[PDB]
Amino acid sequence: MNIFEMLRIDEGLRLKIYKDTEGYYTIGIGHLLTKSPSLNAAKSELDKAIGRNTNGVITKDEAEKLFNQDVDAAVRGILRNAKLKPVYDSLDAVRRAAAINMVFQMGETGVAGFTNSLRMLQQKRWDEAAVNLAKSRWYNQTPNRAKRVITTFRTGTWDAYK
Ligand SMILES: [Cl-]
Ligand SMILES: [Cl-]
């Protein structure tokens, strides 16, 4: 298991513009196109992202190229963020994958607001972090995904994903 296979389980793969759990236009492997209610705005964001006239459909290769860029972008966002980077550096390889999953889902700014959880993760207080991570809109809106990510931070294994 790795970050790619993890996010592929959590996000799915859809080759046509769809709305995500929040109602936002999305395509591929959780690639958010726009928060705007306009499907025309989505299509135009999609065209720009892929570099051709898509009419709201992309191929598998194209969904995987977006995925690759997005995983890369989430890593680079962790490493440039003063609050995330120290936590990430302190973690083992499995729990690093959990931190990436969270940033991919909710952005660097969102994860950086989990101030208390980040401190507990940094101190390696796993059971405590997991309890605090769960007291969140994140956990209440997407409980099954959030449980898998929280289990990863708690155990340091891929058990929630097998
Ligand atoms: Cl893009
Ligand atoms: Cl969920």
Swiss-Prot record:
| Xref: CDD domains | T4-like_lys (cd00735)
Impact of changing D20C on the protein? Nearly no effet on specific enzymatic activity
Q: A single GO BP annotation from the record?
A: defense response to bacterium
GO MF annotations in UniProt: lysozyme activity
Predominant localisation class: host cell
Entry-linked HAMAP family: ENDOLYSIN_T4
Tagged with keyword Hydrolase: yes
Which catalytic reaction applies to this protein? Answer: Hydrolysis of (1->4)-beta-linkages between N-acetylmuramic acid and N-acetyl-D-glucosamine residues in a peptidoglycan and between N-acetyl-D-glucosamine residues in chitodextrins
Role played: Endolysin with lysozyme activity that degrades host peptidoglycans and participates with the holin and spanin proteins in the sequential events which lead to the programmed host cell lysis releasing the mature viral particles. Once the holin has permeabilized the host cell membrane, the endolysin can reach the periplasm and break down the peptidoglycan layer.
Enzyme kind, highest EC tier:
hydrolase
Stated family: Belongs to the glycosyl hydrolase 24 family.
Q: Which organism is it from?
A: Enterobacteria phage T4
Cellular component GO terms, alphabetical: host cell cytoplasm
The highest taxon in the source lineage is Viruses
**Per UniProt, what is one Pfam family of this protein?**
Phage_lysozyme
Induction field: Expressed late in the viral replication.
Q: What are its E.C. numbers?
A: 3.2.1.17
Binding residues for substrate: L32, F104, S117, N132
Location within or outside the cell:
Host cytoplasm
Looking up PANTHER family in the UniProt record yields: T4-TYPE LYSOZYME 1-RELATED
Q: Which InterPro entries match?
A: Endolysin_T4_type (IPR034690), Glyco_hydro_24 (IPR002196), Lysozyme-like_dom_sf (IPR023346), Lysozyme_dom_sf (IPR023347), Phage_lysozyme-like (IPR052619), T4-type_lysozyme (IPR001165)
| Name this polypeptide is given | Endolysin
Functional pH dependence: Optimum pH is 7.3.
Q: Which residues form the signal peptide?
A: none
Q: Tell me the keywords, alphabetical order.
A: Antimicrobial, Bacteriolytic enzyme, Cytolysis, Glycosidase, Host cell lysis by virus, Host cytoplasm, Hydrolase, Viral release from host cell
Catalytic residues per the record? E11, D20
> Entry's Gene3D superfamilies?
1.10.530.40
